[PDB]
Amino acid sequence: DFPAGTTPNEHNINGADYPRIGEDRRVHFRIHAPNAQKVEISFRGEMTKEADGYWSLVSKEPEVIGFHYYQVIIDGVSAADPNGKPFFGMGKWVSGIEIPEKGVDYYSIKNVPHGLISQSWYYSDIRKEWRRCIVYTPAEYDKNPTKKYPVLYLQHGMGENETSWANQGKMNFIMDNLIAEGKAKPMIVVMDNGNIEVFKTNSGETPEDARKRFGAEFPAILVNEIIPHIESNFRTLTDRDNRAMAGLSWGGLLTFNTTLNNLDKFAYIGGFSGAGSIDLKQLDTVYGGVFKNRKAFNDKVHVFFLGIGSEEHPERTKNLSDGLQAAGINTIYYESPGTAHEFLTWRRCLKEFAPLLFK
Amino acid sequence: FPAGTTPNEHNINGADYPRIGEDRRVHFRIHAPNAQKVEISFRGEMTKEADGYWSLVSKEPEVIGFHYYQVIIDGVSAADPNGKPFFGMGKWVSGIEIPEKGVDYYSIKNVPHGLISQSWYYSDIRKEWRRCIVYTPAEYDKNPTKKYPVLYLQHGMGENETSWANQGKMNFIMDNLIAEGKAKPMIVVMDNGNIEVFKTNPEDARKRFGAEFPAILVNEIIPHIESNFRTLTDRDNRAMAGLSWGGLLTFNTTLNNLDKFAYIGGFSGAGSIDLKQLDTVYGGVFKNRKAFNDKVHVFFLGIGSEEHPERTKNLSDGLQAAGINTIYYESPGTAHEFLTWRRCLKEFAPLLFK
């Protein structure tokens, strides 16, 4: 029946025997499409025609560990694999390949207490719309009725939305395991929508104009609508020492703009392969001069975390970190070995960052 | 955009098609320059347009409510890349929502909203971790020592534990019912019947289909819910309802465990009862009419007017003629789709725990 040494991809729907993952980390795709002229797998090129109207494709080389978005492409039309569970990435609902790592389980389901992942609705006056945020509460939450928790606000990048961290990010098992093992403080995590699903430039706009607009309302939405909603409906501490924020990719830039313009509300800042930048040549004036007084900044911001995959040009982020440190701004630098601009890098970033919070 | 059309509710952000007209015709538009043939499921081929686009407008007005669909590219069925996902027909597909006039109980309103939560537990019976979906009422955490009655709510064949809270819109149905004082604040638990795909190894497969779910619910789900949510755990505070094959699962669970359930609902259910053996079926639980009617406070049988209600109406009438109380509900204008079951939930949940 199936090629030797393959198991079904973890993100297949029940009953779907393909795609399959092999012990050599090659992926095996197989689709019945007798009336199609051409079938591709995103980022992998064309499949081969087989008997009985089937198409196959096997990774030319071992694939990289971690999570990878994919779609099937039928005569040029990209769609989610009918065999797959859905993930929101690349601006729509697509599919996901999972390549297992050896000797790793911090994002696996273990026999420890599991927090809830909850859908929570609130109205936004800024955007004149109902919005849904995703909230992790720790497993001990309901059994500690008088306790208040600190909050981490955790943001996605471009082409993602409020569901991505808990879905392809596996963030709830990361938090469950970290908390069970005593490595991170029991905390609430709030995951909302940056409104950066699809990047568009309007006809009168320069590229700079469009980037400046891209998710530009999120800082105000977070500080003026998400925080009040969260504090009204969950048992939270509300002082700055108990409020953290991290974002991946463009979400790292939203995090820089939210937190560094609202230091009275945030004391922990995390960029995961962030698009946020700091002009070292202007350290004393950028962001309204909050970096000028080194001790005051280092005293106010307890964790300033910069993460990056080793296969996505780490030198830019390492140069920024080394530059900040040489000027007297504390940073935590983390480099994810073997990974690039994909979710395994950010799973590792969360596992490294969450233990540093609220201590 | 054509006059009098609006984007379908279940589009992703930025998707302008498909759209819904005021006449309830659906407008599909797909960019497929290099495809020989493009279809929409249950509506035939689309028309080749300029720019390598394809278009399709419903021939006749479509029925109110929710309808699964896929786009078909040269014979390969797939979810609409413009659409949010719904689990139905055994995979993740797409959904059309045809609005109703003057109806809002499954809409989002300016009322308190309960959480929809994901909760994990291990099942010895199936040797696997499993996720359940749990509605807690809006007041849940504002009343830290209150305990709540529980409704276990099950999907049909081809669906799973997410179907009720997505295409079923049950969290807003509950929010509105609770806010208006028509249902008691309650916890609702939606699990996976393991009936995504029916496939054989004859009618022996039907005996096996979902057969472990009664044991899973009673021996694994309920102890997990009760350890982790503030719940009332006596039989008068536990209900169960299910749609289609879930209705069969509900009959087999509740009637063989009457010491645990006091409310039973079948929404277009496949559950049956041979009236000619009413006295012996299910272990004879029905033989003593008064004992049954005092134990089971609500026995609800819902059906759509357009999916042959007569066999449900006859069961309800025959039970009543034999002395077994029932509540019969007929959804006018709907068939074996999800608006029928949204309406069943809207009718059933106000009857519970009173």
Q: Does B92 touch chain A (CB under 8 A)?
A: yes
Q: Does A185 touch chain B (CB under 8 A)?
A: no
B28 within 8 A of B298, measured Cβ to Cβ: no
In angstroms, rounded to a whole number, what is the distance separating the alpha carbons of residues B29 and B20?
12
- Which residues of chain B neighbour A37 with C-beta distances below 8 Å? 34, 36, 74
Of A79, A118, A130, the CB nearest to B78: A79
**By C-alpha distance, which of B254, B226, B223 is closest to B240?**
B254
Inter-chain residue contact A74 with B71, CB threshold 8 Å: no
Residues 15-34 of A with CB under 8 A from B: 15, 31, 33-34
In angstroms, rounded to a whole number, what is the distance separating the alpha carbons of residues B136 and A146?
19
Residue A233: which residues within 8 A CB-CB, separation 6 or more? Answer: A120, B141
What do you get for the CA distance between the two ends of chain B, in Å? 50
Query: What resolution does the deposited structure have, in angstroms?
Result: 2.2
B295 backbone dihedrals φ, ψ, rounded to 5°? -75, -40
- The pair of three-digit structure tokens given for residue A308, joined into one six-digit string: 């990056």
User: Which helix (H) or strand (E) segment is A326 a member of?
Assistant: helix A314-327
A84 within 8 A of A71, measured Cβ to Cβ: no
Inter-chain residue contact B78 with A74, CB threshold 8 Å: yes
In angstroms, rounded to a whole number, what is the distance separating the alpha carbons of residues B38 and B193?
34
Our CA angle for A155, A158, A159, nearest 5°, is 110
Inter-chain residue contact B35 with A79, CB threshold 8 Å: no
Within 10 angstroms of residue B4's Cβ, the number of other Cβ atoms is: 11
- The structure tokens 């995090």 sit at A255
CA B31 to chain centre: 33
Beta-bridge partner residues of B96: B67
Determine which of B76, B89, B190, B227 to mutate to test the interface with A (most A C-beta atoms within 10 Å): B76
Inter-chain residue contact B115 with A118, CB threshold 8 Å: yes
Inter-chain residue contact B141 with A15, CB threshold 8 Å: no
What kind of experiment solved this structure?
Answer: X-ray
Chain B's closest residue to A33, CA to CA, is B76
What would the 3-class secondary structure string for A176-245 be?
HHHHHCCCCCCCEEEECCCCCCCCCCCCCCCHHHHHHHCCCCHHHHHHHHHHHHHHHHCCECCCHHHEEE
A63 within 8 A of A44, measured Cβ to Cβ: no
B311 backbone dihedrals φ, ψ, rounded to 5°? -75, -30
User: Closest approach of chain B CAs to the CA of A116, in angstroms?
Assistant: 6
Chain B's closest residue to A131, CA to CA, is B108
What would the 3-class secondary structure string for B25-62 be?
CEEEEEECCCCCCEEECCCEECEECCCCEEEEECCCCC
Where are chain B's structural domains?
A: 1-100, 101-354
- The pair of three-digit structure tokens given for residue A188, joined into one six-digit string: 């609430």
